[PDB]
RNA sequence: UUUAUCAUUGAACGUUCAUUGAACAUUGAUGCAAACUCCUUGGUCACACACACGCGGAAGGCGUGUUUGCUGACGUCCCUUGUUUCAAUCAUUGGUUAACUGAUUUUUGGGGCCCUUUGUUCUUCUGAGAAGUGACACCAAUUGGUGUUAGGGGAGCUGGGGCCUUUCAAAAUUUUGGAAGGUCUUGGUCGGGUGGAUCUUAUAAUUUUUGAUUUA
């Protein structure tokens, strides 16, 4: 935002608000002409100050979202980095992770939730909490029902308590009707 | 290009002009010469280097020619592997402007020497 | 002595240059030390063969008379070598 | 004894120049350098029947639209292969070489 | 013949303006004069096919602003050569001009 | 013969390779050097464009808007604030992944800046001569830090916020620490 | 006039590319003001290998470039 | 449209598969265009908007004149800087018979254009005014470095060109040359082991100019 506020401050020839955003939607929603037969000094200054209100409200929305993400979840996540399947992870840590997985599910921005399941899957890697959480997520909400088989294989591929994941893997593939598998 | 290059000018008079110097390979360098030497090592500001490809060369034979340009910017080309240079654009600032600029540069230089004489005291 | 361009090449020491060679190879990397005879020594060199491959030398020393050109960084556009009028502070005695 | 001085007696004279490449050049000499960097205004230059490098070096010099008509070409000395003088010019006048004369009187 | 107006008199002296008008109108006579009275005005002269091409016009100039067409008040000299005596007419016009 | 150093505005009485190397490595030369290059860039950024702005020749100009000038002290103050802020935005990088992967098995080969093998021999060779008076390296394994939350690490740092819009935050966070 | 700065490569295995495809690997025993190069244990690498005798010296015209195969 | 490794061994009918060893990119690459959008520059001048067959800009060529045989370093005053136009008032000066006309300056007001002068303007300060012409601006650690100190107009003086008048000389009323005055236009306000530039000579032998880039 500092880069882009600085960038709004630098623009001065008033024809490159076209390359800022689309000309028509700059007219209809925000009421600035790019073609203007006037002195164009106060017009540009009003233009810049009018655009700073739009960037306020965008900064409000995304600042509220990030202050939420931080204060609820990332203030309680300390370890991100997958040390060595010997090492253990705190209970309050797991308590944050599963809520964060739960949190992103509601956003439905799929790239973010693929990323956050895969991302929590780094230091959680093989506890069979997050893998089962994924598979029961994909079967329930997104409904691919074969991607859950796939990730479920990939966490049979390491999760030291393999019991629950082998049972859930059985059930998923019985639904899949891949019986020869 | 109707540029009408100075009929009695050589390299030192050609300074800050936009050149189109051509090499042994047949590559062309385009840019402001800012300096030369005895061996014709040129610098070339904001230089772009253009080839023709081997395939477009067929169309060049006895027309629109997809020259391939890479952008070399401030380069400093050598006098061994060139062929010949011509002039493509005149410089930005005209002869009066270059002349007044050189006057200001000389006045500032004399002033800096006065400041050296002052600090030496 | 030198003249302006090889003085510039003496100036751009330790900064990311790119060399074409006469073979078509364009080495690129930090410039350890140039000489007056344009033999230039380079470090962290990433090389483009004529065939189209790319490799990574650590420590190259390309001879001057097979340089096609050299590209220095942009800022040396503004260099005190180019100043046409800078007067000499009383040469030594 | 060098013969570049001969060419230095040839400002504002209209020659052709054939290059080591094969480029042929038509247009007056404005000067010539010590090591024969010959600068030439009012060029039109031609390539006889072909060399692909010379084809590129011809087209790319602007104003091609294979006679290329150019206002001003500096040509490097080690590119000039041979240079055809006008036949109107008298060689008996030029080769006298006042420097070589003075050196004969210097001996 | 047809005379066109607002045709950007600072384009060229003689022949490059005849090239720039023929390029944006991509004719056997394009008379343009450097005198101060006829400045932004020109006259092209092909007569019935030229009347058809004048009836085809919406034409803007290569320097910019739109050109207005109009029919010639008398003729061009090339029309009088097409209708061809004429040398005596040129002599009489020159004698009126020097008068 | 004489090698004029344009930065130092001094001479070298007879050019040779060794006095050139020893001068170009010299700290006086590097200081005047760095001053000059910074100086040319701050001149070119400071220098106003001032184009010709060829004004064309032209009913619908009925609306009139008020310009906003400032005081000369107010001008100089806001320009100084913008100078400091440009200088911040250019210099600042983002740490995070250093502070994120602090405990990692191979953090101390990869992010510790000259154990990377690729840029690695540089920072040993780019080390200056240390003639005046007065590393977490590859030895680190997994069993160095077994359990990172035993010995307390500092929390993840709270994200940064524009002070221009610091007044418009959510007042009263849910869930006090 | 100036003798080249191959002093860092004084005993380290270098790889000349000679001429455009010749690639010779040796140890830099010597250099003169022309980059004529005395190599020891030259072992010409074709992309097959061929050894080149005990000592060798290579023309500083033919030499295009050289890489330090040994660490410095 | 084309292309996306080789070698050895085994098996099946040159191909396919498997194993072993060695060494960017297909959404590319190449060709053909076509369209949209965007970018930077320019006298968007002055005049005029009409029926022929203008000054100051920018780049080059030619001519004349001056000066020097390389160059430069080392050992004026005043007004204004948003501009332009119109009316009124007042002052001065000239002419004609206190009146009139013209010019200039000051003030007030209106109209147009412009304020991207983007920091609302050569620098600083104040919200157009005030001050100045070593100072200011700024980056590093008082020191060091870079940039800026402007633009326009008028006068004095000086340089050049053009015209006119007078005088003197020469040649056969005319031509040429010199001087002076007036008018117009444009411009300005001696030394040195010093360095730099150009050209010679080392220097036609591997590093740029005395050839290994017409691919045979
Ligand atoms: Zn220095």
Curated annotation (Swiss-Prot), chain B:
Any single Gene Ontology cellular-component annotation: commitment complex
Motif (Nuclear localization signal): 95-121
Annotated Basic and acidic residues bias: 98-108
Localization per Swiss-Prot or TrEMBL: Nucleus; Cytoplasm
Record keywords: Cytoplasm, mRNA processing, mRNA splicing, Nucleus, Ribonucleoprotein, RNA-binding
Domain Sm: 6-91
Recorded GO MF terms: RNA binding; snRNP binding
GO BP terms in the entry: 7-methylguanosine cap hypermethylation; mRNA 5'-splice site recognition; mRNA splicing, via spliceosome; spliceosomal complex assembly; spliceosomal snRNP assembly; U2-type prespliceosome assembly
Domain notes: C-terminal extension may function as a nuclear localization signal (NLS).
Assembly and oligomerization: Component of the Sm core complex, present in spliceosomal snRNP U1, U2, U4/U6 and U5. The core complex contains SMB1, SMD1, SMD2, SMD3, SME1, SMX3 and SMX2 (Sm proteins B, D1, D2, D3, E, F and G, respectively), and is probably a heptameric ring structure. SMB1 specifically interacts with SMD3.
Additional detail: Present with 861 molecules/cell in log phase SD medium.
Similarity-based family: Belongs to the snRNP SmB/SmN family.
Job description of the protein: Plays a role in pre-mRNA splicing as a core component of the spliceosomal U1, U2, U4 and U5 small nuclear ribonucleoproteins (snRNPs), the building blocks of the spliceosome.
Identification of the protein by name: Small nuclear ribonucleoprotein-associated protein B
UniProtKB/Swiss-Prot annotation, chain C:
Domain Sm: from-to ranges: 4-76
Family as reported in the entry's similarity comment: Belongs to the snRNP core protein family.
PROSITE patterns named in the record: SM
GO molecular function: mRNA binding; RNA binding
Broad class of the protein's primary localization: cytoplasm
InterPro entries attached to this UniProt entry: LSm4/Sm_D1/D3, LSM_dom_sf, Sm, Sm_dom_euk/arc, SmD3
Keywords attached to this entry: Cytoplasm, mRNA processing, mRNA splicing, Nucleus, Ribonucleoprotein, RNA-binding
Function: Plays a role in pre-mRNA splicing as a core component of the spliceosomal U1, U2, U4 and U5 small nuclear ribonucleoproteins (snRNPs), the building blocks of the spliceosome. Also binds telomerase RNA and is required for its accumulation.
GO CC terms, sorted: catalytic step 2 spliceosome; commitment complex; cytoplasm; cytosol; nucleus; precatalytic spliceosome; Prp19 complex; SMN-Sm protein complex
Name under which the protein is recorded: Small nuclear ribonucleoprotein Sm D3
One GO BP annotation of this record: mRNA 5'-splice site recognition
Compartment(s) where it occurs, according to its Swiss-Prot or TrEMBL record: Cytoplasm, Cytosol; Nucleus
One Pfam entry name: LSM
Complex formation: Component of the Sm core complex, present in spliceosomal snRNP U1, U2, U4/U6 and U5. The core complex contains SMB1, SMD1, SMD2, SMD3, SME1, SMX3 and SMX2 (Sm proteins B, D1, D2, D3, E, F and G, respectively), and is probably a heptameric ring structure. SMD3 specifically interacts with SMB1.
From Swiss-Prot, chain D:
Whole-protein coverage range: 1 to 119 of 146
GO function term, MF aspect, one: mRNA binding
Recorded domain comment: C-terminal extension may function as a nuclear localization signal (NLS).
An annotated GO BP: mRNA splicing, via spliceosome
The keyword ATP-binding appears for this protein: no
Classification of source organism: Eukaryota, Fungi, Dikarya, Ascomycota, Saccharomycotina
Primary location recorded for the protein, binned into one broad class: nucleus
Residues in Sm domain copies: 2-89
Keywords: Cytoplasm, mRNA processing, mRNA splicing, Nucleus, Ribonucleoprotein, RNA-binding
GO cellular component: catalytic step 2 spliceosome; commitment complex; cytoplasm; cytosol; nucleus; pICln-Sm protein complex; precatalytic spliceosome; Prp19 complex
Record localization: Nucleus; Cytoplasm
Name by which UniProt lists this protein: Small nuclear ribonucleoprotein Sm D1
Entry function: lays a role in pre-mRNA splicing as a core component of the spliceosomal U1, U2, U4 and U5 small nuclear ribonucleoproteins (snRNPs), the building blocks of the spliceosome. Also binds telomerase RNA and is required for its accumulation.
Quaternary context: Component of the Sm core complex, present in spliceosomal snRNP U1, U2, U4/U6 and U5. The core complex contains SMB1, SMD1, SMD2, SMD3, SME1, SMX3 and SMX2 (Sm proteins B, D1, D2, D3, E, F and G, respectively), and is probably a heptameric ring structure.
Extra remark beyond the main annotation: Present with 2400 molecules/cell in log phase SD medium.
Similarity field: Belongs to the snRNP core protein family.
Keyword Cytoplasm: yes
Swiss-Prot record, chain G:
Subcellular location field: Nucleus; Cytoplasm
Any one of the GO BP annotations: spliceosomal complex assembly
Keyword terms: Cytoplasm, mRNA processing, mRNA splicing, Nucleus, Ribonucleoprotein, RNA-binding, Spliceosome
Gene Ontology molecular functions: RNA binding
Principal location: nucleus
Occurrences of domain Sm (ranges): 1-72
Single GO cellular component term: cytoplasm
Classification via PROSITE patterns: SM
CDD domains found in the cross-reference section: Sm_G
Superkingdom assignment: Eukaryota
InterPro entries assigned: Lsm7/SmG-like, LSM_dom_sf, Sm, Sm_dom_euk/arc, Sm_G
Pfam families documented for this protein: LSM
Record-annotated membrane-spanning stretches: none
Keyword RNA-binding: yes
Function field: Plays a role in pre-mRNA splicing as a core component of the spliceosomal U1, U2, U4 and U5 small nuclear ribonucleoproteins (snRNPs), the building blocks of the spliceosome.
Subunit structure: Component of the Sm core complex, present in spliceosomal snRNP U1, U2, U4/U6 and U5. The core complex contains SMB1, SMD1, SMD2, SMD3, SME1, SMX3 and SMX2 (Sm proteins B, D1, D2, D3, E, F and G, respectively), and is probably a heptameric ring structure. SMX2 specifically interacts with SME1.
Note: Present with 1400 molecules/cell in log phase SD medium.
Family of this protein: Belongs to the snRNP Sm proteins family.
Name of this chain's protein: Small nuclear ribonucleoprotein G
Species annotation: Saccharomyces cerevisiae (strain ATCC 204508 / S288c)
Lineage: Eukaryota, Fungi, Dikarya, Ascomycota, Saccharomycotina
